Structures are given as structure tokens and as C-alpha cells.
Design a protein around this ligand. Sequence first.
Ligand SMILES: COc1ccc2cc3[n+](cc2c1OC)CCc1cc2c(cc1-3)OCO2
Ligand SMILES: COc1ccc2cc3[n+](cc2c1OC)CCc1cc2c(cc1-3)OCO2
Lengths: 496, 496
Amino acid sequence: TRKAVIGYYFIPTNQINNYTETDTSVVPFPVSNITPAKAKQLTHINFSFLDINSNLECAWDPATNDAKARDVVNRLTALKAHNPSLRIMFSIGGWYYSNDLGVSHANYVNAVKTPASRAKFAQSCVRIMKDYGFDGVDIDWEYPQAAEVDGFIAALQEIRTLLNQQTITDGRQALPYQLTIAGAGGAFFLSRYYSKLAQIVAPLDYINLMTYDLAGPWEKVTNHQAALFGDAAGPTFYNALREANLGWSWEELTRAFPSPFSLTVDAAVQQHLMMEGVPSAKIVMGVPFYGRAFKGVSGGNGGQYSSHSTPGEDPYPSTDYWLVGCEECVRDKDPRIASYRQLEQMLQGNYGYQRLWNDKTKTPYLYHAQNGLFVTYDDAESFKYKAKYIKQQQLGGVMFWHLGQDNRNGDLLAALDRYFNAADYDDSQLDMGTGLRYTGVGPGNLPIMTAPAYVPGTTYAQGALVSYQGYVWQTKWGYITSAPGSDSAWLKVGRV
Amino acid sequence: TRKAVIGYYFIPTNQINNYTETDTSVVPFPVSNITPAKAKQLTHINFSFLDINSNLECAWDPATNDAKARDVVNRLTALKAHNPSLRIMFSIGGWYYSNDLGVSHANYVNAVKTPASRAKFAQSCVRIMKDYGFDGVDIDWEYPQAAEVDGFIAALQEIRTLLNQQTITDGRQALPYQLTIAGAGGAFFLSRYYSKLAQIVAPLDYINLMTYDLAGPWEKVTNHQAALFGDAAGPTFYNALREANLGWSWEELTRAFPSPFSLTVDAAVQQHLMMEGVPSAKIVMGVPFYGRAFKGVSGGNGGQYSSHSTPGEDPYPSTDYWLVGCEECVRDKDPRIASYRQLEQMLQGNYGYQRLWNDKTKTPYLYHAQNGLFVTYDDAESFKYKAKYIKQQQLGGVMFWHLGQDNRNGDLLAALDRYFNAADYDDSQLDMGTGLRYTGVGPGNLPIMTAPAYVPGTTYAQGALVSYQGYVWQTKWGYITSAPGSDSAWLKVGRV
Ligand SMILES: COc1ccc2cc3[n+](cc2c1OC)CCc1cc2c(cc1-3)OCO2
Ligand SMILES: COc1ccc2cc3[n+](cc2c1OC)CCc1cc2c(cc1-3)OCO2
């Protein structure tokens, strides 16, 4: 089965309203830059972003010129001429619209609140899909809180029901309409809904993990934003999942959620696989096509794990564009983010950057020793290890933000496609290194074990193992006369 | 309010059937030893034990001569002529009948299963009470398991309903019929039903905690069986309450249930009071009128906290009675337990026993250096500290197992009554020592706290405190945009 390759196409309202394929000052990345070769390397394009309005319906931003929007979307769906498996999804939400303090947050909360509201919202999603010609629905609410999760789930179930009906009505068995979400890739936000992951992922084709932005100027210590594995020399974090609303025991929580821990891509993936009912095949690893830049860093680690002086707030609360060589940063008025395209040009421009490699995290970084700058980013090399991980862990594929940030040759997308599909690419000896793996164990990833069947009537000592109702259990203390499941003395430690 | 003084009167069936007040070889402790003075020192006698039979009704051991039982019970209820507050309860259960592997356990489990069975059982209880002249019902099931708790609770509620009706029907408003249970005094057994303590204690006048047998030959290290407070030099135990099905977060469990911990009387009491809806006035502290003995102990600490050679199985798997001086050990054919009466006699008989005192646990012990014997017990000195604790913690009173183990003058019973009621006893300056206190915090003992009201739309840093919906909450990490209770990010730390 082919791995998914899901690329975001983000276009702001003002670029739609002034869309041209002839002026990168106005539209830096028009649809024309998605060549047939690139269209064939994608399985999905997530057009972004739509929103939920005051009427609790899916909708375009009210300032959108609808004729221009339709034309942009038609250009994207025309790419299917080059790739009969390609789907143009649309994404609802994103940080700006749907974060707790964002402009439309209340509409997300209220849309999912009732049977009537969920039905109206779900219908509106399918209507948008059909009217503009999209191939599925992606929801990027960042992020539902605990009390909202059940309504969120029910809304997803309702969309699934309509989409399946629409597939049959439209003859689309060969390319069914799909439903995805963008999920948190770090434990703090994930702990909002982690306990209900199984019910969240049941109606979905994929959950696309945002396994990036794991570092940024809002943290006091510079770090890799998408480390695959952990580096003991780097910062560690409170494991927020041990506070999730799971109902588990102290021993269960402790063995599943070591704390502090390394905030890495492997952590997020393994934390999802620890839950029963979450299939590896639905998990999609997100990767960034951009880096995050920091100023005021010190030496001794190439800029890693240093204090810094980078403002954390949004929008960038300054006019000082200190990322030397970053013309896109001046255009966009933020030196703290740079596309891979721009970073490549900064590297070939002799601006004083060194490209370094951390072989524990398996990620590159830039250090500017003259000016004290650090940039965490991904490239075709880090993507080798991530793609091997996706294959070994039997994940559904890869997602990235976003297409406009690749270089003009499409090298990052071409790399991902190569690592999954090229017949002359062989990563059998790629060394995944000795960086820290996430070691938590939970009900969904218990080791297979054997043990004598439990016998009613028997008194068991501390540490005894038995099999019962399909699991292997271990006593936590002595003189146990109760059966596994029926008494808190037993810990589930294996699968039969 | 007068403190309860609840003494168990245990008599085996063979002693009931051959009852006599003229031959200690046959009945060691006849009721006639309960003089009018001793009668005024008690508030309750728990006659022990009745059972639940295969008809799922309260009943006497079927081997009981009924007339002889009636006569013993009359000897007890005649004592009420000397104390108009005295109640002669009867206790159903005990370890032998009701432990998981005991002879009647299935009858306890099945009696409480359905509305019909609970009604039949409860009416059984009230009928026995009235037929024999008892003043209330005590249930000593050691111990209901989690799936049985709800049924057990309903049975208690049913008994409560009937007893109240009987109160009004017999005009007993001045001395209403009562309902009590014996509860676990150590965390391992307590963990079976701890999460439902509120429901359990609601229908009761008292829950009588079995805060003894906290050490024994089944343990690998010698220790005090009823330490009031902890000794850091002593052994510590896994806190099983952290595995009870409470539904609390990792931080909540950890702050409520330190582990390892000192298995003490104070621990059991404070563990009960950490649960909301468990009033201190219903909690009764149990104390033992017997000691437990260990052989093969090393020197250097008076035999405390040493290895040993004592068998742990029941019945005693030997005829070697190695406890120099203990008559009763041969009579009853177990050298591991000895009444306070017998231990006093061993102390005055110049057998080589030294009485030592632990001023952290506030308890006595006996050491026998030449044959290496260790005895843990209580006496009138340890009872001073336990009685002051009962007063300071506003507990309901004291319970003890059992009357027939006090010395012939009843010094232990007299001591308890004195410490609670004697005008010429003054414990105002009694020093409770520096032993370890149990410091866990839970929903039932959250402190009053004060903090600024939560402000929606505000972002909070790690450690911030707000007031919201009746509690004070603290954030566990930073950049918190969610409301308290609404999120894994916030920890209940106090009450408004
Ligand atoms: C640590 O928590 C934070 C704090 C701040 C965060 C800010 C942003 N994101 C996650 C954040 C986050 O998630 C982990 C997602 C990507 C993004 C794009 C943006 C933007 C802000 C953000 O401004 C406009 O474009
Ligand atoms: C270590 O686990 C055990 C193992 C064995 C145990 C045996 C007994 N108890 C706890 C035990 C225990 O609890 C900790 C409670 C008191 C008791 C009275 C008895 C009796 C046995 C027991 O026989 C009749 O009279």
C-alpha cells in the first residue's frame, strides 16, 4: 500500500482575491508551480484554510472573492489529470481561526455542541466539498478541550456518514471521499483529547500529526523543532499526558508517561500507538518545510540548547529583521521563520551560516557565529531517517506544511517520494543512531507474553505472572486471592 | 459527646456449647469477668461471630446449641442494668468466615447481589437482633472487592432503613439501634473499596478501623503491629491506594499517596479523612489487646526490624511452642500470638523478657535476648497517645479486639475509659513525639486557599494560582489558555 504524501497548499485571502501566476510579489507560489511531476509525487493536497462562521457552518473567509476562489480550486483539481490517485482536500481551521484566543474559536465550540448543530455543520462540510469540487474534508481545530471532545467526535462521525453516502451516490468507490484531521504532535496540547484518541480516529482515514513546532521562541532554550529522537544534552519537558483524563492507575500512568521526557517526533508517534484502537496505518507524520530562527544565542553547542533573546509573541512585535540574508523574512515581517527555499539560498550566499548536523536527533541546524543565530529546520537528509521510521513503524505516510516553502526544484517533496517509492533507493543500512527513543508502554503496545493461566482459589505472591482474558498480568504486592481485572493488585503487562 | 469504647467479646462455638463460669480450662473469659465497673467503662460490646448461611441469611454457626447461645447473650445484655448507654451489638463475619478463601465467603458475595437478596438478608439481620436481644448490627466482612461494593452499600442502606423503623416501633429513641462495620486498617485491603468510602459510611453510626495486625510473621521483617506514627528506621510499604480506581491524575495520586510509606494507625486514619464525605466523628480507631511474637530475631535494636524464623501459615504448622512463659500458646497451640494478660504474666515471671519503648511509634515491645524473641503489643502507655490522637483528630472513639485478652483486673479497658472520661486525668502536656505523620492530601482535606478569580481570555504561566468554581487551582505548565477543571493543565490545590 502506497504511503500517503499530504502537502498543504496555503493561500491567504488577499492572494486569492488578487490571484496571478505572473507576479511572485503578489502570489509567491501559484498553482502553476505544482508541475505534473510534483502532482505525481503527492497523494493529497490540503487546500487551506476555510473556517466555521457565526452560523456554525463551514465557510470561506467572508472577505473571499468567490469567483477567484473557485478558479484557484479548479486549477488545483485540474492536477488530477496528472495523477489519478491525487485528492484535493480542503482544511477547516488552523491556528489563526481556531486556537483558544483566535477569531472564530467560539464557532468551533458551538458547532459541535448539539445533535442539531453537528448535523447542520456536517451537512455544510459536504456541501462545500461538492460545490467547489474537493475530494475530502480535513479539520484542523487547534485544539478541542476535554469537555468538547465528545461533541467533536460525534461531528466527525456525522461527516463520515455523509461522506460514505456521497461516495456511493457519486460512484467514487475507486477514490472514496476522505476525512482527516490535523492532530497535536506534542504532549501538552495532545493531553486535551488524548484519552479519547480511539473514538477520534475511528471515523478518520488519517490523523496527520503536527510533529513540528516542538521548539520555538516561546521556549527559553533553543532546540530542534522536529527532532526524530532525543538528545540527552537537550532540554526535557513535563509529560502532560500523565495528567490526561484516562482513569488509569499510578503504575499504568508512570510506565506510559516517563517525565520529564524528550519532546520528539518519535515520542508523539509512540504516544499515539500506546492507546488501544489507534492503528499505525492511520497515523501520518508531519514534517516542516520551514525552519525556526533564534537570535542572541551563545557558543559551545553550535547554538543548540542556549538561552536567547528572541521575542515569542505574534505578530512579530518589532521591525528588526535580523536573520541575515532572509529576504522572505523582510517581505513577511518576521525573521523567526524561513522557508527551506530561503534557507537554501542563505546557505549558498556566503552570509556566514554553517550547516551542522545532530546525529542523535537526526536533524540539521544552522549556526551563525558572528551574529549569534540558530536555525532549526529539516532537509532531504533528515527526511531519510523520518521516512525509514514511517516504514518501520508501519505508519500511514507523511504530511507537510507547506508546498510553497519547498525550493523551486521541489527537492523536499521529491525526496519524500523517492524514499517511499523509488526502486533504486535502499535504506536497509541507514543508521537510525543512538538518540533517545520514547520508552513508555501502554495498553495499545503491550509486549506479547506467555504465562500460566490464572487459577481461581490460588494465593499469589508478589511478582507472579498469570494469563487471563487474553492478557498477562503481574501482582504488585503479595498474598493475592482476587482475580486479574477484579482487584487493583494486578497490573496488565502483556498480551497473550 | 462521649467517645465510643467498643469491645469485642469473641467466644467460639465450643465454648458457647460448654459454657461455664467455673472452669478457665473450658471457658477462659466468661461474661462474669465483666464486672459492673467494666460494664460502665464500655459503650458497646460486639458479640462475635455470627455468619451468613447458604440461604443468604444472617445465622448462628449451625453447630451452636441455641439455648446456650441465648444464655451467653443474656449474660451480656444483663450488663445493661449497670450502664444505660451500653449496647450489645452482634458482629457478622470475621476473617475465618468471610475472607476470600473462608468457609462462608460466597454467602457474603451472593447475599448483597440483588434487591431481593439484600432485602431478605437485611430482614434476617433485624430478626436475629430482636430474637436474641441485641442492640445493633456490626458487619465484619474482610473484605468486599470492588465489584461487590455497590451491592454491599445497598445492603447497608437496607439494614439502616429497617433498624430505624424498628427504633420507632419499639420506642427506642433514647438508645436507637445502630449499624457499624469493621473496616480495613492497612492500605492493601483498604484499596479494595477505598474509592467508595463515602457511600459505605453514610448509613453507619461508625466504621471501626482494624488498625492492628500491621505487622506479622507473614512479613519478612519484624515491626510494630500498631505503630501510631512512623519510625524512619522501620520498614516501609508500597502504598496500594495509588492503584485504587479513583480516576485521579498522576499529580493527584502522588500527592495523596506517598510511597513507600509507614504503615501506621495515623496513616489509616488520615487516609480515611482524605476522602470527601467521611466525617471524623464516624471513624473509630481499633487497638489490639494482644501481641504478636517472632522467633529468630537479631539483636542491636531490641529485635526491631530484624529478620526472623517464624512460620506464617495458618494453622500453626508445628508443635514447637518457643515463646517461653506463654501458657496460652500451648493451650491454643500457636506461639505467634499472646494476650496482654499472658504477656504481663511473662513480664512478671522473670523469664528473660525486657520491656522496651519506641518513642517514635509510641508503642512498647518485648525483647528476649538469649533465645532471640520479639513481641509487638500495646499497653496503657501506648493507649495514652492513641487516646490523645482520637481527641485531637475528633474521631468517634476506640474499638478493641478483644475483651477476653485484657488482664483479670481489666487494666487496658480501664485505661481507655480513664483517658477519655476521668476528671483526674490530664493529657494536656502529653508530648506526641516526632514520629512520621502521614501527609497525603486529597479531596477531603484540601486546605482553604485564596487566589484571584480566573479571567477568561488570559494566558497563565506555570505555577499560577486562580480561584474558579469553588476551588483554587494551579497550572502545571505554561501558556495556559484553558479554564480550570476544563483541562489537564490545572491542578485542584485548595478550596475557596
Ligand atoms: C507551545 O504552544 C504554542 C505557542 C504558540 C504557537 C504558535 C503557532 N503554532 C503553535 C503554537 C504553540 O503550539 C505548541 C502553530 C503555527 C503558527 C503559525 C502562525 C502563528 C503562530 C503559530 O502566527 C501566525 O502564523
Ligand atoms: C499478608 O497477608 C496475610 C496472610 C494471612 C493473614 C491471616 C490473618 N489476617 C491477615 C492475613 C494477611 O494479611 C496481611 C488477619 C487476622 C487473622 C485472624 C485469624 C486468622 C488469620 C488472620 O486465622 C483465624 O484467625
